[PDB]
């Protein structure tokens, strides 16, 4: 039902958090766009400076909102629906341990999940779908959006 009115989108990383090196964090987001861009004609462009539609940043317990985090476990990240400048935003918990290996909460698992919500997809009930309401580790070596997600994302963007 909710979807972007244009196939052009831009994003900007506010910070890379000291939990991982910038090179490791940059590839993590690129893999997410690659997996989603594989079955969506959406075009993602990285902006060096200025304000972008989807800005990513890492916050801490208090984050100027009536939705404080509950500590390390709990809300690993959250985003707002496809709105004007405020919408399409994405925040991450800096109090958690972000790693690219199988430890704590993998950044790619949460990153891909918020993108699914920003794409207009709702939580999926299939355990193999990334939109699964429960966090689960998966082999990112050959992981591809399952048929459930492909039929849903295609049903929205075609
Ligand atoms: C795999 O990607 C993700 C991304 C976010 C989250 S999450 O913890 O924020 N998450 C799901 C959840 C998880 C375990 C127990 N209860 C709820 C949520 C939680 C905890 C609270 C409220 C909203 C969500 C949510 O759906 N955000 O998109 C979990 C997994
Ligand atoms: Ca939390
Ligand atoms: Zn936030
Ligand atoms: Zn969710």
Swiss-Prot record:
Keywords: Calcium, Collagen degradation, Disease variant, Disulfide bond, Dwarfism, Extracellular matrix, Glycoprotein, Hydrolase, Metal-binding, Metalloprotease, Phosphoprotein, Protease, Repeat, Secreted, Signal, Zinc, Zymogen. The proenzyme is activated by removal of the propeptide; this cleavage can be effected by other matrix metalloproteinases, such as MMP2, MMP3 and MMP14 and may involve several cleavage steps. Cleavage can also be autocatalytic, after partial maturation by another protease or after treatment with 4-aminophenylmercuric acetate (APMA) (in vitro). It is found in: Secreted, Extracellular space, Extracellular matrix; Secreted. Detected in fetal cartilage and calvaria, in chondrocytes of hypertrophic cartilage in vertebrae and in the dorsal end of ribs undergoing ossification, as well as in osteoblasts and periosteal cells below the inner periosteal region of ossified ribs. Detected in chondrocytes from in joint cartilage that have been treated with TNF and IL1B, but not in untreated chondrocytes. Detected in T lymphocytes. Detected in breast carcinoma tissue. The keyword Zinc applies. Induction: Up-regulated by TNF and IL1B. Ca(2+) 3 binds at residues 70-71, 73, 75, 93, 96. Ca(2+) 2 binds at residues 53, 85, 87, 89. One of its GO terms (biological process) is endochondral ossification. Ca(2+) 1 binds at residues 19, 94, 96. Zn(2+) 2 binds at residues 113, 117, 123, 131. GO terms for cellular component: extracellular matrix; extracellular region; extracellular space. Residues 67-137 are annotated as: Interaction with TIMP2. The active site is at residue 114. Glycans are attached at residues 8, 43. Belongs to the peptidase M10A family. It is linked to Spondyloepimetaphyseal dysplasia, Missouri type: A bone disease characterized by moderate to severe metaphyseal changes, mild epiphyseal involvement, rhizomelic shortening of the lower limbs with bowing of the femora and/or tibiae, coxa vara, genu varum and pear-shaped vertebrae in childhood. Epimetaphyseal changes improve with age. Metaphyseal anadysplasia 1: A bone development disorder characterized by skeletal anomalies that resolve spontaneously with age. Clinical characteristics are evident from the first months of life and include slight shortness of stature and a mild varus deformity of the legs. Patients attain a normal stature in adolescence and show improvement or complete resolution of varus deformity of the legs and rhizomelic micromelia. This is Collagenase 3. It comes from Homo sapiens. The chain holds residues 110 to 267 of 471 of the full protein.
């Amino acid at each position: 039902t909710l979807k972007w009115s244009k196939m052009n989108l831009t994003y900007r990383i506010v910070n890379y958090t000291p939990d991982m090196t910038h090179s490791e964090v940059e590839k993590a987001f690129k893999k997410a766009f690659k997996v989603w861009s594989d079955v969506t004609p959406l075009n993602f462009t990285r902006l060096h400076d200025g304000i972008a539609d989807i800005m990513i940043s890492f916050g801490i317990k208090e984050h100027g909102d009536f939705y404080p985090f509950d500590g390390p476990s709990g809300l690993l990240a959250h985003a707002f629906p496809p709105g004007p400048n405020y919408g399409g935003d994405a925040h991450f918990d800096d109090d958690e341990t972000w790693t690219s290996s199988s430890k704590g909460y993998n950044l790619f698992l949460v990153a891909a999940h918020e993108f699914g919500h920003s794409l207009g997809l709702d939580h999926s009930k299939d355990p193999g779908a990334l939109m699964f309401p429960i966090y689960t580790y998966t082999g990112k070596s050959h992981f591809m959006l399952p048929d459930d997600d492909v039929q849903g994302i295609q049903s929205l963007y075609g």
